[PDB]
Amino acid sequence: MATMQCDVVSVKESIYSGAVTMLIAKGAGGELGILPGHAPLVTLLQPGPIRVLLENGTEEIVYVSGGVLEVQPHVVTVLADTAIRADNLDEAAILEARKNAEQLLANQKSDLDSAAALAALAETAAQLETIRKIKNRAQ
């Protein structure tokens, strides 16, 4: 399959940069699949685990909170407020926040706390989902 110059960057620093056969990042609410040779596209990147496929039949899963996704003819750049490598994603950290929301949700008293706990649960669940998939990938 063809190859494209994909580069993932975040507010902390770059995460990926090289050749890719195909990448899939969540944008505009739906899953946008870019292929080597696609036309220029600019869509908002929403929270979701983007996958970067290489020419070696491999794929790299990365978690992005959401930001800006700029697609170029032979180049691809996805800016995310926060990018975490599937191999770097800390399960311990996510487990802490994941349980914090679960216990905070059941003890919901107002709408403010709920909005925060819920947002944390969904976010934490995303990071874990990205890891579990990479570390295992047996679905």
Coordinates of N, CA and C in Angstrom, one line a residue:
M1 N 0.8 -1.2 0.0 CA 0.0 0.0 0.0 C 0.9 1.3 0.0
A2 N 0.3 2.4 -0.5 CA 1.0 3.6 -0.5 C 1.5 4.1 0.9
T3 N 2.2 5.1 0.9 CA 2.7 5.6 2.2 C 2.6 7.2 2.3
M4 N 2.4 7.7 3.5 CA 2.2 9.1 3.7 C 3.0 9.6 4.9
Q5 N 3.4 10.9 4.9 CA 4.1 11.4 6.0 C 3.2 11.9 7.1
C6 N 3.0 11.0 8.1 CA 2.1 11.4 9.2 C 3.0 11.9 10.4
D7 N 2.4 12.9 11.1 CA 3.1 13.5 12.2 C 2.1 14.0 13.3
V8 N 2.2 13.3 14.4 CA 1.3 13.6 15.5 C 2.0 14.6 16.5
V9 N 1.3 15.7 16.8 CA 1.9 16.6 17.8 C 0.9 17.1 18.8
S10 N 1.3 17.4 20.0 CA 0.4 17.9 21.1 C 1.0 19.1 21.8
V11 N 0.3 19.6 22.8 CA 0.7 20.8 23.5 C 2.0 20.5 24.3
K12 N 2.4 19.2 24.5 CA 3.5 18.8 25.2 C 4.7 18.6 24.3
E13 N 4.5 18.1 23.1 CA 5.5 17.9 22.1 C 5.1 16.9 21.1
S14 N 5.9 16.7 20.0 CA 5.6 15.7 19.0 C 5.6 14.3 19.5
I15 N 4.8 13.4 18.9 CA 4.6 12.0 19.3 C 5.0 11.1 18.2
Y16 N 4.6 11.4 17.0 CA 4.9 10.5 15.9 C 5.4 11.4 14.7
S17 N 6.1 10.7 13.8 CA 6.7 11.4 12.6 C 7.4 10.4 11.7
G18 N 6.7 10.0 10.6 CA 7.3 9.1 9.6 C 6.3 8.7 8.5
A19 N 6.5 7.5 8.0 CA 5.7 7.0 6.9 C 4.5 6.2 7.5
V20 N 3.4 6.3 6.8 CA 2.2 5.5 7.2 C 1.3 5.1 6.1
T21 N 0.8 3.9 6.1 CA 0.0 3.3 5.0 C -1.4 3.8 5.1
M22 N -1.9 4.1 6.4 CA -3.2 4.6 6.6 C -3.4 5.0 8.1
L23 N -4.1 6.1 8.4 CA -4.3 6.5 9.7 C -5.8 6.8 10.0
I24 N -6.2 6.5 11.2 CA -7.6 6.7 11.6 C -7.7 7.6 12.8
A25 N -8.3 8.8 12.7 CA -8.4 9.7 13.9 C -9.9 10.2 14.0
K26 N -10.4 10.2 15.2 CA -11.8 10.7 15.4 C -11.9 12.2 15.2
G27 N -12.7 12.6 14.3 CA -12.9 14.0 14.0 C -14.4 14.3 13.6
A28 N -14.9 15.5 14.1 CA -16.2 15.9 13.8 C -17.2 14.9 14.4
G29 N -16.8 14.1 15.3 CA -17.7 13.1 15.9 C -17.6 11.7 15.3
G30 N -17.2 11.7 14.0 CA -17.1 10.5 13.3 C -15.6 10.1 13.1
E31 N -15.4 8.8 12.6 CA -14.0 8.3 12.4 C -13.6 8.7 11.0
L32 N -12.5 9.5 10.9 CA -12.0 9.9 9.6 C -10.8 9.1 9.2
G33 N -10.9 8.3 8.1 CA -9.8 7.5 7.7 C -9.0 8.1 6.5
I34 N -7.8 8.6 6.7 CA -7.0 9.2 5.7 C -6.1 8.2 5.0
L35 N -6.0 8.3 3.7 CA -5.1 7.3 2.9 C -4.1 8.1 2.1
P36 N -2.9 7.6 2.0 CA -1.8 8.2 1.2 C -2.2 8.7 -0.1
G37 N -2.3 10.0 -0.3 CA -2.7 10.6 -1.6 C -4.1 11.3 -1.5
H38 N -4.6 11.5 -0.2 CA -5.8 12.2 0.0 C -5.7 13.7 -0.2
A39 N -6.9 14.3 -0.5 CA -6.9 15.8 -0.7 C -6.8 16.5 0.6
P40 N -6.5 17.8 0.5 CA -6.4 18.7 1.7 C -7.7 18.8 2.5
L41 N -7.7 18.4 3.8 CA -8.9 18.4 4.6 C -8.6 19.0 6.0
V42 N -9.5 19.8 6.5 CA -9.3 20.5 7.8 C -10.5 20.2 8.7
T43 N -10.4 19.3 9.6 CA -11.5 19.0 10.5 C -11.1 19.0 12.0
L44 N -12.0 19.4 12.9 CA -11.7 19.4 14.3 C -11.5 18.0 14.8
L45 N -10.4 17.8 15.6 CA -10.1 16.5 16.1 C -10.7 16.3 17.5
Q46 N -11.6 15.4 17.7 CA -12.3 15.1 18.9 C -11.6 14.0 19.7
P47 N -11.8 13.9 21.0 CA -11.2 12.9 21.9 C -11.4 11.5 21.4
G48 N -10.3 10.8 21.1 CA -10.3 9.5 20.6 C -9.0 8.9 20.3
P49 N -8.8 7.6 20.3 CA -7.5 6.9 20.0 C -7.3 6.8 18.6
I50 N -6.4 7.6 18.0 CA -6.0 7.6 16.6 C -5.0 6.4 16.4
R51 N -5.2 5.8 15.2 CA -4.3 4.6 14.8 C -3.5 5.0 13.6
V52 N -2.2 4.8 13.7 CA -1.3 5.1 12.6 C -0.7 3.8 12.0
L53 N -1.1 3.5 10.8 CA -0.6 2.3 10.1 C 0.7 2.5 9.3
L54 N 1.7 1.7 9.5 CA 2.9 1.8 8.8 C 3.0 0.9 7.6
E55 N 4.0 1.0 6.8 CA 4.1 0.2 5.6 C 4.6 -1.2 5.9
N56 N 4.9 -1.5 7.1 CA 5.4 -2.8 7.6 C 4.2 -3.6 8.1
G57 N 3.0 -3.2 7.7 CA 1.8 -4.0 8.1 C 1.6 -3.8 9.6
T58 N 2.2 -2.8 10.2 CA 2.0 -2.5 11.6 C 1.1 -1.3 11.9
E59 N 0.7 -1.1 13.1 CA -0.2 0.0 13.5 C 0.2 0.5 14.9
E60 N 0.1 1.9 15.1 CA 0.4 2.4 16.4 C -0.8 3.2 16.9
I61 N -1.3 2.8 18.1 CA -2.5 3.4 18.7 C -2.0 4.6 19.6
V62 N -2.6 5.7 19.4 CA -2.3 6.9 20.3 C -3.6 7.6 20.7
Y63 N -3.6 8.0 22.0 CA -4.8 8.7 22.5 C -4.7 10.2 22.4
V64 N -5.7 10.9 21.9 CA -5.7 12.3 21.7 C -7.0 12.9 22.3
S65 N -6.9 14.0 23.1 CA -8.0 14.6 23.7 C -8.9 15.3 22.6
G66 N -8.2 16.0 21.7 CA -8.8 16.7 20.6 C -8.2 18.1 20.4
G67 N -8.2 18.5 19.1 CA -7.6 19.7 18.7 C -7.9 20.1 17.3
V68 N -6.8 20.0 16.5 CA -6.9 20.3 15.1 C -6.3 19.3 14.2
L69 N -7.0 18.9 13.2 CA -6.5 17.8 12.2 C -6.4 18.4 10.8
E70 N -5.1 18.6 10.4 CA -4.9 19.1 9.1 C -4.3 18.1 8.2
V71 N -5.0 17.7 7.1 CA -4.6 16.7 6.2 C -4.0 17.3 4.9
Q72 N -2.8 16.9 4.6 CA -2.1 17.4 3.4 C -2.0 16.4 2.3
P73 N -1.8 16.8 1.0 CA -1.7 15.9 -0.1 C -0.9 14.6 0.2
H74 N 0.4 14.8 0.5 CA 1.2 13.7 0.9 C 1.7 13.8 2.3
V75 N 1.1 14.7 3.1 CA 1.5 14.8 4.5 C 0.2 14.8 5.4
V76 N 0.4 14.4 6.7 CA -0.7 14.3 7.6 C -0.2 14.8 9.0
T77 N -0.9 15.8 9.5 CA -0.6 16.4 10.8 C -1.8 16.5 11.7
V78 N -1.8 15.8 12.9 CA -2.9 15.8 13.8 C -2.5 16.5 15.1
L79 N -3.0 17.7 15.4 CA -2.7 18.4 16.6 C -3.7 18.0 17.7
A80 N -3.2 17.5 18.9 CA -4.1 17.1 20.0 C -3.6 17.8 21.3
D81 N -4.6 18.4 22.0 CA -4.3 19.1 23.2 C -3.5 18.2 24.1
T82 N -3.6 16.9 24.0 CA -2.8 15.9 24.8 C -2.7 14.6 24.1
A83 N -1.5 14.2 23.8 CA -1.2 12.9 23.1 C -0.5 12.0 23.9
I84 N -1.0 10.7 24.0 CA -0.3 9.7 24.8 C -0.1 8.4 24.0
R85 N 1.1 8.0 24.0 CA 1.4 6.7 23.2 C 0.8 5.5 23.9
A86 N 0.3 4.6 23.2 CA -0.3 3.4 23.7 C 0.7 2.6 24.6
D87 N 2.0 2.7 24.3 CA 3.0 2.0 25.0 C 3.5 2.9 26.2
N88 N 3.1 4.2 26.2 CA 3.5 5.1 27.2 C 2.3 5.3 28.2
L89 N 1.1 5.1 27.7 CA -0.1 5.3 28.5 C 0.1 4.6 29.9
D90 N 0.0 5.3 31.0 CA 0.1 4.8 32.3 C -1.2 4.2 32.8
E91 N -1.3 2.9 32.9 CA -2.5 2.3 33.4 C -2.8 2.6 34.8
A92 N -1.7 2.7 35.6 CA -1.9 3.0 37.0 C -2.5 4.4 37.3
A93 N -2.1 5.4 36.5 CA -2.6 6.7 36.6 C -4.1 6.7 36.2
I94 N -4.4 6.1 35.1 CA -5.8 6.0 34.6 C -6.7 5.2 35.6
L95 N -6.2 4.2 36.2 CA -6.9 3.4 37.1 C -7.3 4.2 38.3
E96 N -6.5 5.1 38.7 CA -6.7 6.0 39.9 C -7.9 6.9 39.6
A97 N -7.8 7.6 38.5 CA -8.8 8.6 38.1 C -10.1 7.8 37.7
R98 N -10.0 6.6 37.2 CA -11.1 5.8 36.7 C -12.0 5.4 37.9
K99 N -11.3 5.0 39.0 CA -12.0 4.6 40.2 C -12.5 5.9 41.0
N100 N -11.8 7.0 40.8 CA -12.2 8.2 41.5 C -13.5 8.7 41.0
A101 N -13.7 8.6 39.7 CA -15.0 9.0 39.1 C -16.1 8.0 39.4
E102 N -15.8 6.7 39.4 CA -16.8 5.7 39.7 C -17.4 5.8 41.1
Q103 N -16.5 6.1 42.0 CA -16.9 6.3 43.4 C -17.6 7.7 43.6
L104 N -17.2 8.7 42.7 CA -17.7 10.0 42.8 C -19.0 10.1 42.1
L105 N -19.3 9.2 41.1 CA -20.5 9.2 40.4 C -21.6 8.6 41.2
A106 N -21.4 7.5 41.8 CA -22.4 6.9 42.7 C -22.8 7.8 43.8
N107 N -21.9 8.6 44.3 CA -22.2 9.5 45.4 C -22.5 10.9 44.8
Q108 N -23.1 11.0 43.6 CA -23.5 12.3 43.0 C -24.5 13.0 43.9
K109 N -24.2 14.3 44.1 CA -25.1 15.1 44.9 C -25.7 16.3 44.1
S110 N -24.9 16.8 43.2 CA -25.3 17.9 42.4 C -24.9 17.6 40.9
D111 N -25.2 18.6 40.1 CA -24.9 18.5 38.6 C -23.5 18.9 38.3
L112 N -22.9 19.7 39.1 CA -21.6 20.2 38.9 C -20.6 19.1 39.1
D113 N -20.6 18.4 40.2 CA -19.7 17.3 40.5 C -19.9 16.2 39.4
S114 N -21.2 15.9 39.1 CA -21.5 14.9 38.1 C -20.8 15.2 36.8
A115 N -20.9 16.4 36.3 CA -20.4 16.8 35.1 C -18.8 16.6 35.0
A116 N -18.2 16.8 36.2 CA -16.8 16.6 36.3 C -16.4 15.2 36.4
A117 N -17.1 14.4 37.2 CA -16.9 13.0 37.4 C -17.1 12.2 36.1
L118 N -18.2 12.6 35.4 CA -18.5 11.9 34.2 C -17.5 12.2 33.1
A119 N -17.1 13.4 33.0 CA -16.0 13.8 32.0 C -14.7 13.1 32.3
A120 N -14.5 12.8 33.6 CA -13.2 12.2 34.0 C -13.3 10.7 33.7
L121 N -14.5 10.1 33.9 CA -14.7 8.7 33.7 C -14.6 8.3 32.2
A122 N -15.2 9.2 31.3 CA -15.1 9.0 29.9 C -13.6 9.1 29.4
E123 N -12.9 10.1 29.9 CA -11.6 10.3 29.5 C -10.7 9.2 30.0
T124 N -10.8 8.8 31.3 CA -10.0 7.7 31.8 C -10.3 6.4 31.1
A125 N -11.5 6.2 30.7 CA -11.9 5.0 30.0 C -11.3 4.9 28.7
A126 N -11.1 6.1 28.1 CA -10.5 6.1 26.7 C -9.0 5.7 26.8
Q127 N -8.2 6.3 27.7 CA -6.8 5.9 27.9 C -6.7 4.4 28.1
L128 N -7.5 3.9 29.0 CA -7.5 2.4 29.3 C -7.8 1.6 28.1
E129 N -8.8 2.0 27.3 CA -9.3 1.3 26.1 C -8.2 1.2 25.1
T130 N -7.4 2.3 25.0 CA -6.3 2.4 24.0 C -5.2 1.4 24.4
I131 N -4.9 1.3 25.7 CA -3.9 0.4 26.2 C -4.3 -1.0 26.0
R132 N -5.4 -1.4 26.7 CA -5.9 -2.7 26.7 C -5.9 -3.3 25.2
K133 N -6.2 -2.4 24.3 CA -6.3 -2.8 22.9 C -4.9 -3.1 22.3
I134 N -4.0 -2.2 22.6 CA -2.6 -2.4 22.2 C -1.9 -3.5 22.8
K135 N -1.9 -3.5 24.2 CA -1.2 -4.6 24.9 C -1.8 -6.0 24.6
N136 N -3.1 -6.0 24.3 CA -3.7 -7.3 23.9 C -4.0 -7.4 22.4
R137 N -5.0 -6.6 22.0 CA -5.4 -6.6 20.6 C -6.0 -8.0 20.2
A138 N -6.7 -8.6 21.1 CA -7.3 -9.9 20.8 C -8.8 -9.8 20.9
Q139 N -9.4 -9.0 20.0 CA -10.9 -8.8 20.0 C -11.5 -9.6 18.9

